[PDB]
Scaffold this active site. Structure first.
Site, short mmCIF file in Angstrom:
data_model
loop_
_atom_site.label_atom_id
_atom_site.label_comp_id
_atom_site.label_asym_id
_atom_site.label_seq_id
_atom_site.Cartn_x
_atom_site.Cartn_y
_atom_site.Cartn_z
N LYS D 161 43.32 34.12 37.06
CA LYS D 161 44.00 35.14 37.85
C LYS D 161 45.38 34.58 38.18
CE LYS D 161 39.68 36.81 39.84
NZ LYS D 161 39.78 38.02 38.99
N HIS D 280 31.30 40.76 28.38
CA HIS D 280 31.64 41.29 29.70
C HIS D 280 31.15 42.73 29.73
CE1 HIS D 280 33.99 42.89 33.03
NE2 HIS D 280 34.19 41.64 33.42
N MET D 283 32.87 48.59 32.79
CA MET D 283 32.55 50.02 32.86
C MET D 283 31.06 50.34 33.07
SD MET D 283 32.78 52.55 29.53
CE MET D 283 32.12 54.02 30.35
N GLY D 385 37.27 31.35 43.65
CA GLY D 385 36.57 30.16 44.10
C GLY D 385 37.11 28.86 43.52
#
Ligand SMILES: O=C(O)[C@H](O)[C@@H](O)[C@H](O)[C@H](O)COP(=O)(O)O
Ligand SMILES: O=C(O)[C@H](O)[C@@H](O)[C@H](O)[C@H](O)COP(=O)(O)O
Ligand SMILES: O=C(O)[C@H](O)[C@@H](O)[C@H](O)[C@H](O)COP(=O)(O)O
Ligand SMILES: [Mg+2]
Ligand SMILES: [Mg+2]
Ligand SMILES: [Mg+2]
Ligand SMILES: [Mg+2]
Lengths: 225, 444, 122, 443, 119, 105, 122
Positions: D161, D280, D283, D385
């Site tokens: 991120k 992953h 949706m 985290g």
């Protein structure tokens, strides 16, 4: 009704440009006796849908949707016969991702029109809707700096000379010495492709040896165009 | 200034013409204000993170965040609102419907603070849609290729879907086509199965297409389903259809997937094949008003990914307005905002071709007037039982439907009101068409 | 139970499954074209159907194009004028099929096509 | 004779299922005035041979061999209009090796039938005869552990991120720091495919440098889930091919948004080229969130195991339900257990299992619970985290790795992670400054 | 001409002609066919060839475009032609144009008995 | 005088057919034929699509005009001086050409 | 407005759009050939147009070649001699098309081709 044939459809000073239009700024020099308004119209007509005689096939579609239009004309300060004619071209006239077609469509025909003594395309407004259909730079400024791990200064290179006359090995030797001294790149002259006495693959081999020898010596990434 | 530890609701935000806009029907959990709900929708479908991360300091977040710029109550509902979110153009991979869906609906629907969520509409900007091929051909090109004008197209969906031999299946097709139908179709479930392997079906259906075409003089086709377990198999089937020289193939875009559908759409464009799209499984996602994705979003996605035909329901009866809404989104170049028709955003397709909507279900001859009035000429009307169920067989059944359709078209062109003279128009046609008369008696 | 004919019933797309159009019926279809602001045009051919002689790749067919009778009647506001031309075509080519097509400059496509005359044996 | 037009055939209460039938458990909510028998019966007809009017072609075959049958209906304890309808589908209806066809055949049409107010597919009994026509996971749990030489603990990863906004190089830098601190993997966000400012090939190059730099530094095998999800299959494979060239161990795919046809192709490529495949479930909530309509995740999970995947996201820490589908994803034989949402006994006849992945707003204090719930065969993803640790990615990775090993050590000694969890973490804080720093921020 | 036109000591420069020696020209294929081969392939002799450049260049559907071609060719022209700007664009993609122009080429050729083509 | 600054030898490399285009029509046929000779292509855009009777008659007019010029030239007539007469004479037996000549005179 | 015929007007390339060539017209065309130092030759066929039976690749057509009537008239200085041969050909093959072609040894190619006779009904 369709009949015989024969600015009336190309100089539109009221036209408000669309965000999808490709815009062009032409420096136009009209022939003697040619009104500035007529020249601008001609620039738009002859770079789009202008036809000398009326054709009935035009009745099978809507012209105003495909015509380039001169929406503004500005006299050039200091010239008694020079103006900037602005023309807007609809997005639909262009093939996606093709600079070849963009140039063909805008500058492919108009420069030869007799009513224009001289003509120069000064700028083009490339709308995002069209540019997004292009890959663009393989990498670009930022990616290149990250790939080469070079920051905070202009890059440096040496263009090998004489462009022609050196053997591939002597050429590579010149490259190695340039790179090991602190230059980031060495470069092939624009004329250097593949020629007698220095065939391209041989040049690539020796230049590659030079690139890696200098890189290992200095510790900095090196390259050769 | 980092600071480890535990930005999305911007009512002042002015949307950019390059933004992808979304209208979400959100149902907040108890104790969650609608303003908070809207921000969560935007944050959880973009740059929102539970704890502060120092990496955010390496870029400019306000350039990549989704923003909820407007929230409004839903008429009737007591805890439902429409939250409008704007997504920067840079968030999406060019030409990838897969990435557009992943980016907008990939994560937010499971967010705890949201009891329910439904994506109602998406404003696809020209700057993004231009990165997509879109329909392999589109409405106008299809009509020109098939040389068919001034009337909805007609097709018959072969039944039983499973159980017939490839040859018996093809025989049914030939009889339907020779009677006046433009197309016959593979059921969405018909791919390749024991007793009817795909290549055998393609061979016999091709014989049927050409036999009926030679007999009638009109171009015929059969939606040969290329849907498969892998992309290699899907393309393999399209390749044989290409070799056979037939005009159209089919794909179940939602079950096959967008990555595969886009690949197939590209193949069809490169090889001149029309592409019929079936919306199998759509109701799993678009039926409930409180959660999922409205079909209009799935429809826009298909137009972008690529398809020449797409099922649009039955809309049969005398929802109507909502259907007309997404039908326009599928066929037109420019569609103005119209909440009365479920159109939340003005949509400009900048010349991307339209898709032909397909009506299907338990429809028969008596529905012809209504269907013609609702869809107009640019549509395909599929009659499964409405053809195979004719008392005299497939050819007469096809003729009955073709006659009923042309009678409606003629009447409409003359200026008659289909919405009021429908039954009389059909009854008048029964006077000279024994085939239609027989059909009308069975299904009235 | 009745069997659909296998011969002598070849078609010409839209409206060809209806009974032979009377003059009055024809005028109404032409007026529709005119009221819709579309341009009528006549097309004729001695071969009335599609075939595949030069290629069999997807979407390719021969026989889709017919020959244009004069030019599209731009500015036409009298359906009777179209009838007049149809009569001339029939007189000049009594052994050819004649159909009426329509073009719309807005959608920029041909969008109408229906048979108007069939010889004395087709 | 073929005569005419417009729960008497599709409702078979004593039908005995065949070992080759594909079975389905549907949660059905009938429209007002619709008997549950007709409801369950319509579910069967509309997901098979239903037809509003009689067609003569039916006389050319034996439709009873192709119809789905509702063989049992029961109410959902607590609903005046919700039942579980069990339907059996003949093996012959499905194309071998095609999850796409299985889904099309069972859920492609029935959900829109108006006699039904709502419908949700809860579970599917995949018969061995049908599952044997699928490759399944490119490698599976056991092969993966052997390839990476990792045993006795959940694997650890960090999701990079911000997902978008970083340059490919800065992105790779973040990856290296995470991996060198103790994490086994770093990961591309589901949305990260190829975009302006960070094109996929550049990301693959820098992430590859990061993988190898961290691996050389620590001595442990490292990886990065390189997302190959793309707009077309050609692009998807193109990305997997470069990962192959780089020699990295794992790639990634958003199976639902990319689609099953594409996913199966990728699973095949991975098997043929020794690449692990991280899946992953982007949706999924659009489909599996509501109890009244859609498809429960366990169905989507079984579908993924069949289509092919080595890892699959499974949540963040409902409990009983999660343990149930985790077993469906990992084990060879799972007995029916309504308490855990397992409607059918499922036999996978040696098809490899898939490693479940936990993610979300989790941190060091959740380590004992995660370890207790999932056990060793799982992957725990810590985005915030890790990247949120006050000392950076390396210390953040170390904190998570230490917390996990502290939990594993304690568990192995016989301690109760569910009751001694906080004490286990507090004790570890006393000798690990990295963990102590993390524990003070997320307490 | 790659570098010299920008030299500041020159106000203007125009390359008027080039003498291409046989030793260099022989390293090029040159025309795919050339004047004589073309005449023999098309079986056309003793007169200039004739063609029509389709207009409007943009705005026609591929089919209407092809219709115009057929009519031109059947009247006596040897060729019909795509405008320099006509490559592939919205409303008239190249493959569709090729299909329809091909139908036009063969329809007119069969009708007249003379070989036809479309650039 | 013709812009040829160097003697050029192509050593058998085939020639290219020159193409004339622009605002040309039937009345230019004699001049075009005389200037370029047989080895050329003459493109008539508006000169065909602009014929009052349509494309086919337009094409016929151009084909007739050209062949009339070719015939006259072959017989030994001067296209540079008798052009208009050659075209006018052809108009007598070609209604298509006559129609074209009336529009673009 | 007049419609261009769709049948009965098939062509034979150069000069076939002019009215039927009279004997005088032909003589002048032949004299042009002799004056230009080109060699005249007659060719005939019962099939007058091109077709594509053996292949459809670019540049391939059947029916381009016709049959040679005797040999090229090398050294011919009297155009009347060519007419004489045309008459013989017509007498022997009244049902065949006959065209006059020309060869140039300097350009080393055939460079002239025009129809001189069409059978009754063609
Ligand atoms: O085989 C068929 O006859 C159709 O596939 C049919 O079963 C389907 O129910 C309708 O097409 C409407 O379905 P949607 O409204 O879901 O498109
Ligand atoms: O990027 C990440 O940090 C994750 O993608 C995160 O956004 C997601 O919310 C969780 O993985 C749980 O999602 P599901 O339980 O829906 O898988
Ligand atoms: O579309 C056309 O009709 C032509 O392409 C035309 O527009 C062009 O002006 C002429 O070909 C002459 O141009 P040049 O002399 O510049 O070639
Ligand atoms: Mg240089
Ligand atoms: Mg179906
Ligand atoms: Mg994520
Ligand atoms: Mg041009």
């Amino acid at each position: 009704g369709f009949k015989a044939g024969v600015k009336l459809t190309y100089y539109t000073p009221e036209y408000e440009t669309k965000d999808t239009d490709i815009l062009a700024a032409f420096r136009v020099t009209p022939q003697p006796g040619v009104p500035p308004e007529e020249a601008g119209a001609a620039v738009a007509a002859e770079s789009s849908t202008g036809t000398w005689t009326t054709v009935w096939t035009d009745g099978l579609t809507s012209l105003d949707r495909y015509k380039g239009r001169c929406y503004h004309i500005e006299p050039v300060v200091g010239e008694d016969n020079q103006y900037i004619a602005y023309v807007a071209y609809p997005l639909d006239l262009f093939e996606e991702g093709s600079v070849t077609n963009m140039f063909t469509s805008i500058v492919g025909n108009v420069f030869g029109f007799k009513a224009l003594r001289a003509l120069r395309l000064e700028d083009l407004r490339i709308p995002p809707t069209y540019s997004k259909t292009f890959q663009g730079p393989p990498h670009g400024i930022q990616v290149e700096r990250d790939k080469l791990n070079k920051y905070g200064r202009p890059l440096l290179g040496c263009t090998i000379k004489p462009k022609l006359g050196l053997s591939a090995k002597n050429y590579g030797r010149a490259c190695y010495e340039c790179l090991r001294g602190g230059l980031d790149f060495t470069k092939d002259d624009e004329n250097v492709n593949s020629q007698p006495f220095m065939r391209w693959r041989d040049r690539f081999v020796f230049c590659a040896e030079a690139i890696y020898k200098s890189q290992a010596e200095t510790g900095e990434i090196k390259g050769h165009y | 200034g980092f600071k480890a530890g535990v930005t999305y609701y911007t009512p002042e935000y002015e949307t950019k013409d390059t933004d992808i806009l979304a209208a979400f029907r959100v149902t907040p959990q108890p104790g969650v204000p609608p303003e908070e709900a809207g921000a969560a929708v935007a944050a959880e479908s973009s740059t929102g993170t539970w704890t502060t991360v120092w990496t955010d300091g390496l870029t400019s977040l306000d350039r990549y965040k989704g923003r909820c710029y407007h929230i409004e109550p839903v008429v009737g509902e007591d805890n439902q609102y429409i939250a409008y979110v704007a997504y920067p153009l840079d968030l999406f991979e060019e030409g990838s419907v897969t990435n557009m869906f992943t980016s907008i609906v990939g994560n937010v629907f499971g967010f705890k603070a949201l009891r329910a969520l439904r994506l109602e509409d998406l404003r696809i900007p020209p700057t993004y849609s231009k990165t997509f091929q879109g329909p392999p051909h589109g409405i106008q090109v299809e009509r020109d290729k098939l040389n068919k004008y001034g009337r909805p197209l007609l097709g018959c969906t072969i039944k039983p879907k499973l159980g017939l031999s490839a040859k018996n299946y093809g025989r049914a097709c030939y009889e339907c086509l020779r009677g006046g139908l433009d197309f016959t179709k593979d059921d969405e479930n018909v791919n390749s199965q024991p007793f009817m392997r795909w290549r055998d079906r393609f061979v016999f259906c091709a014989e049927a297409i050409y036999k009926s075409q030679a007999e009638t003089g009109e171009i015929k086709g059969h939606y040969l389903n290329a849907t498969a377990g892998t992309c290699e198999e899907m393309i393999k089937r399209a390749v044989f259809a290409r070799e056979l020289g037939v005009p159209i193939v089919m794909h179940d875009y939602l079950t096959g997937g967008f990555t595969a559908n886009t690949s197939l759409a590209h193949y069809c464009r490169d090889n001149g094949l029309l592409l019929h799209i079936h919306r199998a499984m759509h109701a799993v996602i678009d039926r409930q008003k409180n959660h999922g994705m409205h079909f209009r979003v799935l429809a826009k996605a298909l137009r972008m990914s690529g398809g020449d035909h797409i099922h649009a329901g039955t809309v049969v009866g005398k929802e109507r307005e909502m259907t007309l809404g997404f039908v326009d989104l599928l066929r037109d170049d420019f569609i103005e905002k119209d909440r009365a028709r479920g159109i939340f955003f003005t949509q400009d397709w900048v010349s991307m071709p339209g898709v032909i909507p397909v009506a299907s279900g338990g429809i028969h001859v008596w529905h012809m007037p209504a269907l013609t009035e609702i869809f107009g000429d640019d549509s395909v009307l599929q009659f499964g039982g409405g053809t195979l169920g004719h008392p005299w067989g497939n050819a007469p059944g096809a003729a009955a439907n073709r006659v009923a359709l042309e009678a409606c078209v003629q009447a409409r062109n003359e200026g008659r009101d289909l919405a009021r003279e429908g039954n009389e128009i059909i009854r008048s046609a029964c006077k000279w068409s024994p085939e239609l008369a027989a059909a009308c008696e069975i299904w009235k | 139970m009745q069997v659909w004919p296998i011969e002598g019933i070849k078609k010409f797309e839209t409206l060809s499954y209806l009974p032979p159009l009377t003059v009055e019926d024809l005028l109404k279809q032409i007026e529709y074209l005119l009221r819709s602001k579309w341009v009528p045009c006549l097309e004729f051919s001695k071969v009335g159907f599609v075939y595949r002689e030069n290629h069999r790749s997807p979407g390719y067919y021969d026989g889709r194009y017919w020959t244009m009778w004069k030019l599209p009647m731009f500015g036409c506001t009298d359906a009777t004028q179209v009838l007049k031309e149809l009569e001339e075509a029939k007189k000049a080519y009594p052994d050819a099929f004649v159909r009426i097509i329509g073009f719309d400059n807005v959608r920029q496509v041909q969008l109408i096509s229906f048979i108007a005359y069939k010889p004395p044996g087709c």
